[PDB]
RNA sequence: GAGUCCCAUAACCUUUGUACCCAGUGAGAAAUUGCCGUUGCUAUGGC
């Protein structure tokens, strides 16, 4: 297999990029891959989204394995781009994460895109 | 470092012989040892940087034997007498302690039995405890071989 | 391990009678191995040939239940098979 | 706590496990390997009698569920100095690297991992820990590795899957002894989301009933973790009742 | 049907026991069934050892290992399952083998078309009876430690599987980098020893000699420095990289030195200092070739970015190469200045996550890397 | 985005269009209380990203991310007014003239629908409609508009006096393609729909980003008709590019195949009224002109049009001829970015300019 | 008679020389062609 695995597929992927828009406008998602590390190693994340056409594939790889060591889900993206204007910054982003609040509007949609990207790997 | 550089590989420890390293009964086991051993292969590359450290190791203990007679001798030229009684060693570490012979010569024989104690000989003379009944001088040979009470005597 | 392999809602009356077969067909010879077979008999007026997986042997890496429907004209009470043919009676 | 800070250390009532005091008390393990941390973590040095250094590792337990049960008040832990633990899930290896200091250089722990890059790290720590077998390997499938592992005195499970029941119960038929001992950890939300972590928790219990596992105790790992649990039980195959 | 034969696959070899008494199976599930398997003296009254093949070696070993787990059957397993299984017929009454993997069943079927498996609930308490009690049914048979067998055919399963380089291990660059500021810390200790030990005989000379190396190369080439003359001058020239002129202002500061001539035994001493410092230079500059290649196999992205040693500064400090790559950019340390150093840190990082990431890794991204970070210099 | 209106002249059909005066806003113009009603300055601070001209021929409104509208008076050049949109989070994305009026519809990024009439210099009423931001607004003679948001894939038809919608939504299933295909290629399914255009007062067509263009009429909820990756598949990422590794085998691998094929965005759109004519612009480097059949139901490509390269931010068309001979004049503000963000990177030979395409009917 | 090991083979302190220094945060920053090159003397390459 590939080094960008699993990778979603389009309505998942559309569901995906519709949950990350509406935790950006909640404020419940971290943009990077450097604050995806970062929310992994605070505990905070509950699951991060990576972009496969990312060039070098390698510099998100680190990801995965945090990913496998706190038990956070973790899914693959076709574009970079797509997942910027997801995210509603200017520029591409590779990797995003959704952070955790308690008391959050979007907590039943974002439980569920969980249970499908727990449900993938 | 001399069996590093004897055999290289655990294949190899069947071929060479480590009679002249050591006794080699508990390497006769480690001979089986290694062949059912846990480690893995390694790269050639490693192993002649490997050999080039066991070199320095063996090399530094060469150097030591050559210092420890370097000292014997100076031992035996400045003073045979002390040297006859408590050895190179005792003896080196002595003038050492003192910083120099005459000093050591117009030292009494009650500091020289305690030379080298001087934390626990200061601490009982502050705090009214037991003093120590010797320092440097228990690793001379004859109290050694004295046991129980008699080392102090 | 006291459970059971299959159970079978076969007939509607009461099964009246029960035996274990091992059927000998003229064409083809079922997987004794792999398969047990047995015959029931009920007062719907109806004999039935089940088969049933069995896990006893891994020799290899089918169909469990109805292969034949024996029907009659009456009830039937009871039923056995023979020991070396195929033969059976109600 | 902070560095250069003295502590007493001293016995826990389990084996292996150790109390720092100070102002704030720590678990501790004793270290196979002085001088190395496997993840970061505090570490306690013992000049011990000439003096050889003695170094001990603070046991973290928001980051192994076997150092929460044991802060917890677990009664009976069945991993001890000198036995031979089955460790399923073993991951990057962190938690079991501590099962090794508890089992000592007498005991072996046959670390199963599935995925091979978590894996290259517990192979590398078994080079520091020899008592640390690594088995990268399914542990879903346990006829693969019946060549390796032979007849484990206890065996913890870590694994988060929703088949963890089964999964136990081949590796104990296999390679636990009779009257042994399983640690489980388990997590409601990957077992079942949809039901509460009560349920979840019986039904886990009732799968290890039929399984001949008899429970003998049970936690919940808080406030380190949230809907986490820990079932002791023994391994009966003689019969439960 | 009835057990036979059952087979047991060791470390060490594969092992065929016969199975001389039947346990029965409608109570398998009783107290005194279930405990007849702890028992020695009543499995003993089961189960009977008639074969053992060992292995040839922990090659043999490893290979039946992963053929046991693909479920497929060695020449091995046919060779024992030849000599010891009767020849039945294939129509009626097979010979029943118990087989702990389900798996391996159909195989051996292919293999033997007259051997039925049996892998059923019975066989597995068996198997689990022999896995058991283990040494006490091979009569001594067994040739070699069955325990530190396992362990290390464990870990060769794991290694295999893995397939884990050793070449790509960066352990070696790990102890080298600290093996290489050793050596650094005692030549130059050691240097200084030579310099003074050789100063109180001619202090000139070691202000005149700016290299540590080189000063004890021509310590030891030129010895004395009443002995040292115009030919000798010539000779350390080359020493000296055809320094002629400077040999012979060393000449003429020997001339007006006023240290003493040193003896026999000092000079003696001296040169053994100067020949220590000698090997260790040459120690350190093998390593340093050494480190330098082993960065170029490893991490090739980072160490044409920062440089080989500061790379493997970086590598030590962190532990490992893929602890690096775990930690953030923020968390790697390597005005305008604070700026270009978080510049560089985040190119680190990504560098280094190449390197760990990639199977075998190619520099061109870190020249990319490289070009960035100038063209961000040139900007500032 | 360099805050600058510019005025051209497009009446010679032959010759390139000439620029008559610019007006340029700067940093200047950040106002000082920054308390969302004080937001009254001449000129725009922020990046201006649409404009309108009001159809008799006096005023120019421009409105942008500063979050106000500027209404210029078109002979100086010069701000006649300036309309604060008085939200802190509504930005200007589409301006539209009601034909022959002087009402303008607004759609801003709050959710909103803002009406102005301009001679008076007034705002009638607010609509509020969608989940997502409303990117594009069109509207024929009559007082209604047609709206879209992006991610609620959703087109409103809105009735401007009655404050009433209907809704339209996509809904479609790439399983339910490939399986009518398997029945009888890459189905990407639809993440935004960004442009709209009316072609009469009972159809319109929307493009979105998997390149799908529907025509859509009032009648029926889903679409009649969809064209699907109507300007292309964007080029393979570069196989030494996207892996690292020596072997180009593994980057191949890595490419991991067709997965990573994502199809270009309809940028821009545009109908000309009452007719079948209508063009679409992407950054494909090619206009497209398309042909709406007699029936209404379906629509072919008729031409392409090669001349412009780069991202087809806007199109207009433009009519000077007899009735029985028109010549039709279609002008693309060709940019090296997407209007809204600067997602779309390093595309080949792109210059920021007019693109201007002279047709004549046979 | 009498506490080497607890490193008087040591630790701490002072002074001098040699140096060095005063991990986060997470979206802002800037405010026929602007400039350059080629082709005509008009066409289109780069930033």
Known sequence: ?121 | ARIILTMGIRSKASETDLSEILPEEIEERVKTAAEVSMGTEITQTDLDNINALAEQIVEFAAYREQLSNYLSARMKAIAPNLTQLVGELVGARLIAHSGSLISLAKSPASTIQILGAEKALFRALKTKHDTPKYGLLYHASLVGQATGKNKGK | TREEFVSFKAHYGLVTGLCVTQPRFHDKKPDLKSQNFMLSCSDDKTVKLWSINVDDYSNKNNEEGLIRTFDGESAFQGIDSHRENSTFAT | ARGGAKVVIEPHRHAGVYIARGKEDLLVTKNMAPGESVYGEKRISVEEPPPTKVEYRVWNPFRSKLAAGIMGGLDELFIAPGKKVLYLGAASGTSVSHVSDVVGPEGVVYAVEFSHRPGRELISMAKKRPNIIPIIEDARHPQKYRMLIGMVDCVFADVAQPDQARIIALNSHMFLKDQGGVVISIKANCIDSTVDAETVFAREVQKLREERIKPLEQLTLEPYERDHCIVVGRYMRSGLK | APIEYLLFEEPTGYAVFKVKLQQDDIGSRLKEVQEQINDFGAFTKLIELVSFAPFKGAAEALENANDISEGLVSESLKAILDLNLPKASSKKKNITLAISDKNLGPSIKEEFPYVDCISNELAQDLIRGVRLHGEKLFKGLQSGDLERAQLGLGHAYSRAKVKFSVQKNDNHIIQAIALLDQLDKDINTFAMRVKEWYGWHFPELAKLVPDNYTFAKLVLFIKDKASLNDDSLHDLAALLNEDSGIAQRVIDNARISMGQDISETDMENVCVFAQRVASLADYRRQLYDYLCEKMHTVAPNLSELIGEVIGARLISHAGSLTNLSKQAASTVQIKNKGRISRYLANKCSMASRIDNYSEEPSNVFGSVLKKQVEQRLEFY | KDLQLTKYDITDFSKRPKKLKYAKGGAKYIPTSKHEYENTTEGHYDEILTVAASPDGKYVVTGGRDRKLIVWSTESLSPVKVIPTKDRRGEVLSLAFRKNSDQLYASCADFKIRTYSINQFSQLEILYGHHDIVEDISALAMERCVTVGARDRTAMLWKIPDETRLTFRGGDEPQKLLRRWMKEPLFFCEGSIDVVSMVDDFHFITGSDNGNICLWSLAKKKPIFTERIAHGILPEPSFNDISGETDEELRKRQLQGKKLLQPFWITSLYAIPYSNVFISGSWSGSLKVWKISDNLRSFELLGELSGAKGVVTKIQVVESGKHGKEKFRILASIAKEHRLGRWIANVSGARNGIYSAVIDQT
């Open chain 1, 1 to 121: 297999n590939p080094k960008a695995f699993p990778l979603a597929d389009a309505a998942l992927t559309q569901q995906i990029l519709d949950v990350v828009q509406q935790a950006a406008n909640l404020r419940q998602l971290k943009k990077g891959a450097n604050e995806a590390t970062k929310t992994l190693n605070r505990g905070i994340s509950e699951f991060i989204i990576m972009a496969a056409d990312c060039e070098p594939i390698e510099i998100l790889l680190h990801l995965p394995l945090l990913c496998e060591d706190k038990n956070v889900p973790y899914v693959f993206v076709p574009s970079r781009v797509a997942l910027g204007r997801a995210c509603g910054v200017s520029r591409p982003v590779i990797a995003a994460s959704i952070t955790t609040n308690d008391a959050s509007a979007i907590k039943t949609q974002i439980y569920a895109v969980k249970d499908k990207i727990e449900t993938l790997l």
